[PDB]
Amino acid sequence: SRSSWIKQLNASLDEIDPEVADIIELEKARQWKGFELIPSENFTSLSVMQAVGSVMTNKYSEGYPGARYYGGNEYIDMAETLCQKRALEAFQLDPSKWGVNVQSLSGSPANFQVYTALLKPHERIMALDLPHGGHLSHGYQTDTKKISAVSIFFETMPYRLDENTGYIDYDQLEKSAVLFRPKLIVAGASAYARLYDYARIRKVCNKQKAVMLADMAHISGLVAAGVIPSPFEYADVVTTTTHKSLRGPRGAMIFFRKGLKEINKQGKEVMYDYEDRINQAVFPGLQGGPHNHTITGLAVALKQARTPEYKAYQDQVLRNCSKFAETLLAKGYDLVSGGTDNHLVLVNLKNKGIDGSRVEKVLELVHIAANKNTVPGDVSAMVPGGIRMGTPALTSRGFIEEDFAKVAEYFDLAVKIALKIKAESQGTKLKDFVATMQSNEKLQSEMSKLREMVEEYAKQFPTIGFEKETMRYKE
Amino acid sequence: SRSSWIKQLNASLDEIDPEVADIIELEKARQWKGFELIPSENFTSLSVMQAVGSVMTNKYSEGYPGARYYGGNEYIDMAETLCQKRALEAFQLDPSKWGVNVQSLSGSPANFQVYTALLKPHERIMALDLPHGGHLSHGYQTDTKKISAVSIFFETMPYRLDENTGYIDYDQLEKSAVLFRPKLIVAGASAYARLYDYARIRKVCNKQKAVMLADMAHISGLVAAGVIPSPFEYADVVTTTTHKSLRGPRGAMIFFRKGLKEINKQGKEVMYDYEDRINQAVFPGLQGGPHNHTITGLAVALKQARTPEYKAYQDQVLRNCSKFAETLLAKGYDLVSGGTDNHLVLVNLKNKGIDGSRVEKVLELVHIAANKNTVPGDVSAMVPGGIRMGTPALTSRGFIEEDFAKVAEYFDLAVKIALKIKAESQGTKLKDFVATMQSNEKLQSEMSKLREMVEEYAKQFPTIGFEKETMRYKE
Amino acid sequence: SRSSWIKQLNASLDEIDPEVADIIELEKARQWKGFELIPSENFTSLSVMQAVGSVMTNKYSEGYPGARYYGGNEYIDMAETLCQKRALEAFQLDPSKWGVNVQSLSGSPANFQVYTALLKPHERIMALDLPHGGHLSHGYQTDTKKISAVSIFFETMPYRLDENTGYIDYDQLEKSAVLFRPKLIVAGASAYARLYDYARIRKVCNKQKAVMLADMAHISGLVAAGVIPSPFEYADVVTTTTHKSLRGPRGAMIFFRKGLKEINKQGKEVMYDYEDRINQAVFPGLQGGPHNHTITGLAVALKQARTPEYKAYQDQVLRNCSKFAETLLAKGYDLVSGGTDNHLVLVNLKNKGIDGSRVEKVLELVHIAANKNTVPGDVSAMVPGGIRMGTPALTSRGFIEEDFAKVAEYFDLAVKIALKIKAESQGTKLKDFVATMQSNEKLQSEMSKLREMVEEYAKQFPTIGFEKETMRYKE
Amino acid sequence: SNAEKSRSSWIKQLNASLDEIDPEVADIIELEKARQWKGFELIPSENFTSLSVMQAVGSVMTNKYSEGYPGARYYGGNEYIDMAETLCQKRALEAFQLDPSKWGVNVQSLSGSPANFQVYTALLKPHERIMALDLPHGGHLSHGYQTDTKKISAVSIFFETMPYRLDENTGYIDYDQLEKSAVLFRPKLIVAGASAYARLYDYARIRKVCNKQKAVMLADMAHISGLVAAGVIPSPFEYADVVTTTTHKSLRGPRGAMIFFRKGLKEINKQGKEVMYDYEDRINQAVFPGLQGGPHNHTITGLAVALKQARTPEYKAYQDQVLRNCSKFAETLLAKGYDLVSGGTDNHLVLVNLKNKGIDGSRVEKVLELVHIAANKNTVPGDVSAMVPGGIRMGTPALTSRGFIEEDFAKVAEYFDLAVKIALKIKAESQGTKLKDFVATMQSNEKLQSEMSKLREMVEEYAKQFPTIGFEKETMRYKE
Ligand SMILES: CN(Cc1cnc2nc(N)nc(N)c2n1)c1ccc(C(=O)N[C@@H](CCC(=O)O)C(=O)O)cc1
Ligand SMILES: CN(Cc1cnc2nc(N)nc(N)c2n1)c1ccc(C(=O)N[C@@H](CCC(=O)O)C(=O)O)cc1
Ligand SMILES: Cc1ncc(COP(=O)(O)O)c(CN[C@@H](CO)C(=O)O)c1O
Ligand SMILES: Cc1ncc(COP(=O)(O)O)c(CN[C@@H](CO)C(=O)O)c1O
Ligand SMILES: Cc1ncc(COP(=O)(O)O)c(CN[C@@H](CO)C(=O)O)c1O
């Protein structure tokens, strides 16, 4: 059994677990044949995946480079030090003014670790309201329930959009902050199509003596390439995931000011007080052993973020989204804020007489991956009135402006099918919509035809991270 | 532009990032050449790593199978459902009595998610004291500082070993619980060498109406193979990491009772109330998108845990540690609790007149990877008096009992060198010990000789997860 | 020896403690010869004082009538039950819809006991901002310090005046409450000259599902007499002191809704859930033995509150304050909100070119007792711009409208002296003002003349609660 | 006409006597006066206040608002209120022989329970840890208390409490277990104070534990403060950081409280820096503006009177008699076959463990009440439930104030014993085993009712002979 279990440890996935191998092959074909429009998704490189799938996973390395609680970490230290160096370089940060923690396991715990580092329990946080494009890891509660645990352990209050313009209502943010006295204000969003006024957030944070946390998860790759303004110009702390526009592994980073404070902010302490608190909140506070396979893959992704090819990619992401929005507007769709400055759009389906749940069900059946999304003016969060879509993932496969014009066309055809399913539905209920969607033979034929059109279009483009020639599912 | 960055996305790690490729090859050689004795470390299979390094990383799948927020999750749902099914099967659990969450990113957040699910902020937790072999994610504070964030957000109090026997003092645990009124008691440890009396903990939890949480991270593979008694016989909730004795990817699982608990005095069924609370604490409470590459690799590892070869491995892990302990004792070392019933030992160096920091520095230089560790009787956590070592990792490479007798010999030779360095150190500070260790030619030669002995012994064994023939650093 | 301490226990205050007896005689003369304008002060009756100074103080009576810890409480129960029933009658409350607790020791703990009964620690409270006329027992924090412990144990946020009108800005209160989600809103003030819009507060509390607490301490006697609108029409809970306009002993009452609240969606009766929680928060939650002497004096005060002459008194309080306000306005003073609808006025002195601290120092020296008071627009609570004055105390002595016209004249003469002291001061500091006020023979003579005028006017009126003829200090 | 008629009417209302204005309340007070005349008042927390204190508490000092502290007020008109509070503080320090450079005092706290809560609020953050004597072992609710069911005291809601307990073999506090518990629990504050404990505290031992844990030592001396002031037992001020007390109970003052706290140098630390005590500002600010508003100046003035009395030789003689009476009481109970918790007493009370008499405290307390002997049932070591107590608590302060001496408390023990004999007869005649069957017999058995009537007459006849405290017998409305 000794030599036998060594064979099982060194055999390939195809031989050891054909069921799992088949699932991955099906997912490869899904990524090949679909319109992947979820703006938080991307296709990471083969080189990142080879690092994440390496023996770096075997090592325990609690602590920080050169200051570990375990032996054997000479090369894990090289990886984490290299990752930190490349993280600062990717955002053109002076290492005497900025530090970074690369151990946070994902975006949601990264933010919680910042709160734990800098705030006592029940201290006050302001952030963009979830139904107005915020994120759960900034806090969220309903009339009856705290949904995010951020709102359990800390005291949260939202700020909102101007529902007439679709931009953040900074005037109301400032006035609210005077009364609520936040200790930390979050500048970051999941479904905001415009650029943040980081200068205004900084002004409010200075008046309130609040920490300015920029959560740039969605835009980090755009920031790294220098194609939009950087939150590092203003923020005290910057969190980000590594798997969205950055195009890296699933993970996160926390950046923070260090060294001497501004002349007019030096007092009983002259140095920033973020580095030790954040590093200690990550470990020993809330995490144990770093995931060194992810950290090593992150180092790879951060080197890729420096290249001219990467800047060209992020430029194309923005130009594709601009064209995408223009085509949607010309086909009659309403966009929240009327357009976009970044990688995503938010379609408000109110002017079409159908909701996001119904449209997304059709999108899924025609191999278009998006998400239903609350829009300003929605009466209920349970019934989202919009669809969120973006350009990072298909841009990575080589979609350019005319290709996203085609994506908008096929989105439009899917909405028209959803409207027919609604018209053919007997009752008002979503259950009746689904029953029509699964029983009507003519409308199933139209969805089947649209699905073939999407797949034929998407299949022409390169696959990212694997070769077409060795795919199990080539049809 | 297009074809340029698409080639970057599909190129190998060797092509794209030679510096990172070099670091991984160095780490491969280190895992080949050394005694990897950290008891929380293992060598996972190639098939696990191929799944972790797959395109499953690209998908956002917030929610649970068949109840996602995004579209496109048909195959991610297969993987997570398969992982859940295999998790219950690996521990012989009745799915009508047990459920499982496989999304928790690692062991430390998994425990925090259980606390957040079942306890209000500042409610009370008892667990094994960190200096007596507990874990930071069960709580820990000094008289001046909360070290673990568990002790910030919840109210923790330790239970302790009988310092005469090295076993948990269950009588004092019970008496303390009467006074402290815990809402949850943790049964699990990082450096405890004996089996838990889960039945006794169950009786205390019943008396206190406290949740019984077994944290089986270290022993989960032993439990899965059935070679030690199972905490599932008694516990309400069981947490575990997946990368230690289980031999899987870096990740975690939370198991919990579900279904009928009891009939009340009025004949009405009373159901367990763990499942919804725990699942909602993981998401949307504390995490965002699941790491589907890790969940997929975990499904692979859980299938591997079912084989007769895996059971033979875990039986060898136990026999190896017994022989290891026996040989250390014969060579004059003291072990906490005087021996072992599991996969690890904790050496208390007090009778040798040297601390764990000094010994671990020599171990590191002779390529024995272990950790300095606090022991009962240490006056300061800054000066650990022990060394923790265990058998899972080298047993995975085929070490058997006589091989761990040799590991004990080489550990002893390293301690003898550390004692010589201490004797030659003119000063008493650790930096004086380091200065002697780095400048004394005779003792550098002794360490070089022992390092060569360790490497010659370790290199003869198979490498796990890669082949020797293609190693870049064979010399 | 036994005879020795019996004599000590039964001797008069004059025999036992001449120093304390003399202090009381000096205070009697001060209450006789001065203008007592502090609007939270009154002169309570001889009969109340005889009950408060009775042997009812000797009994320990933890618990509630008929449910005491100890025996011997048959007559204490007569008094407390009588007090409770008289309390409901004093405010014309239906005892099937309202209950009352009469044990709370004073106004500040009464509010804290309500919060403890109905809110978990760190739950949210809104109340009128302290510098805008609120009270510390509703919460208060500065930029750097929690001043009220209500703001330590609960999460507080103020609502504010419209600084253009001096009335509460109910529109902003409602908007703030949407974002802050208070669990309790306080409707009550210490330095607000207008009537509360209780119906508007009720509307906001209904929308927010918040408890409506009316703190009527200042206006309780006006409410009992039925000469201003009652908060009991709208509030869930009503707190009050017993020593202000109610004219009773120093103490407090907590009223709460009980019985049927409404019918739910299933047609089921929903009952109020305040009574048990509040009674248990008072005892055993936060207090021990009731002060039976105060409760007995309170019963006496509540019987007085039901009489026609008590209503005539409170009607006179209102007419006196209206005349007072009219006379101040005619003499060029600015009043916050432009006037009054209750028992007090708040004079904003800024248009006269002097502050409240300086004016109050002169008032004190001419035997006019008022308080310096923050006004809306003050930047520092350390430099108050206003003076607060009211009519309950002097109305009790028989001052009528023409007499308060005279009070306004003498106030104005004191302001003129303060302005002369400021003009003569050799410096701008309060310390320089005081030095001039104490050394300038001419201004000292003017203050002596005004003091004689105040005392000659006040001495004409009856003494309340003691006989003028037997006073020690009749000169 | 009517306006002036009304004004004259409400002024007449304010100046009329209680007898004229509210005869119903006056009658209640007269009934309570007669009750205090006729009973054996053995509840050890009760006492009889002096006339001079009551005259100050019932004075026009009640009319004044004086938020803040002497010389630092937020209202005008406080020249004489300042004299009273300053005098009260001075006499408070003098009553316990305290150096004002080492001790400060706050005299504004409204009663014993909020006084402790104010100390916790001053010195502890929310949810920080407190240890105190368990309530059924002799503690007090204001130190925290929770059952398996729920948190009873709000101290246990806002702070994290854990009890320490008696050695149930000896009846003394188990100081060894307290120390071991503190190592694990890490209290920030330990309370040394009891309400139903017949022994004095080992303040030296508490001090050692507090020093080792870097915890505040709070002595809550409510039950013993008058003994401390008279110098007849050791003082908590020798050891404690902060001392709270009721001003009623042992001290025999008005209903109120005091908070004492160390001032000045705590230690010179390892770096050579003076560490000063940080209690005065935190406690004073917790009382106001933190948790209270206007001081109750009538109570503060009555307290100054009580504190002057506490320094006299008559008061010292009284507190000496309190202790000697309790010892004689204990002597007589032991001679009559009763067991005392801890085997005796060192203070003003005893805890009778009724186990060897075959009857519990609930039954005995009911008979005592019917014969006008005021005592209270009390948990004793060995009880299975805190709800069915096996003992009775009795003490000497109140009757000693009326002039009971040693031979009189021998008689009190005799009449207590006669009541126990009646309770045992009721239990023997009870058709059933539950407490309601006992009450059914107690209310129905004509012969046993007659014995209780006889014993009640004996109790009242004995008590009536002694002086009344705080009022004259001659002017009582109820002279029978
Ligand atoms: C003690 N206290 C409460 C307070 C203030 N004025 C009163 N005035 C009266 N007549 N009565 C009171 N009971 C009263 N209480 C205070 C203390 C300081 C500040 C204060 O200075 N606040 C400033 C600055 C303090 C800071 O920022 O640190 C602010 O931020 O608005 C206010 C109120
Ligand atoms: C408020 N309080 C003190 C209390 C209650 N009632 C009294 N009743 C009287 N007549 N006298 C008292 N001194 C008295 N004291 C309480 C409240 C609940 C429990 C209680 O429930 N104890 C549990 C046992 C303790 C536990 O569960 O930890 C029980 O079995 O009833 C005890 C005391
Ligand atoms: C601004 C921001 N901060 C944090 C996170 C969380 O990252 P995680 O999913 O890795 O936890 C997200 C993820 N956002 C996902 C939903 O979770 C999205 O599709 O937009 C985010 O948008
Ligand atoms: C019982 C238990 N529960 C949880 C964890 C945390 O797992 P994580 O490191 O993946 O967070 C550990 C890790 N234990 C590591 C140190 O963190 C070890 O070397 O032993 C653990 O031992
Ligand atoms: C609305 C309200 N609620 C509560 C209180 C507190 O009463 P207390 O001083 O008896 O604690 C007050 C007292 N107000 C006093 C200052 O404390 C005053 O001069 O106005 C109050 O105005």
Numbering used by the authors:
A (entry chain B), B (entry chain A), C (entry chain C): 43 to 517
D (entry chain D): 38 to 517
Text taken from the publication that reported this structure:
Serine hydroxymethyltransferase (SHMT) reversibly interconverts serine and tetrahydrofolate (THF) into glycine and 5,10-methylene-THF (5,10-meTHF). Next, we have obtained high resolution crystal structures of AtSHMT2 complexed with MTX and PTX, as well as of AtSHMT4-MTX complex.
Interfaces between subunits A/B and C/D are much more extensive than e.g. between A and D. In the crystal structure of AtSHMT2-MTX complex, we noted two binding modes of MTX, one corresponding to external PLP-Ser aldimine state (EA-type; chains A, B, C) and the other to PLP internal aldimine + free serine state (IA-type; chain D). In this case, direct hydrogen bonds dock exocyclic N4 of MTX to Oε of Glu104* (an asterisk indicates a residue from another, tightly bound subunit), and N2 of MTX to backbone O of Lys414. A network of water-mediated hydrogen bonds link the antifolate to Thr416, Ala423, and Glu104*. Altogether, five out of six heteroatoms of the P-moiety (pteridine-2,4-diamine) participate in hydrogen bonding. B-moiety is sandwiched by the side chains of Ile189 and Tyr182 from one side and Ala423 from the other side. In the P-moiety, exocyclic N2 H-bonds to carbonyl O of Tyr111* and to Nζ of Lys414. The pteridine ring is again stacked with the side chain of Tyr111*, however, it is rotated by 66° with respect to the ring in the EA-type binding.
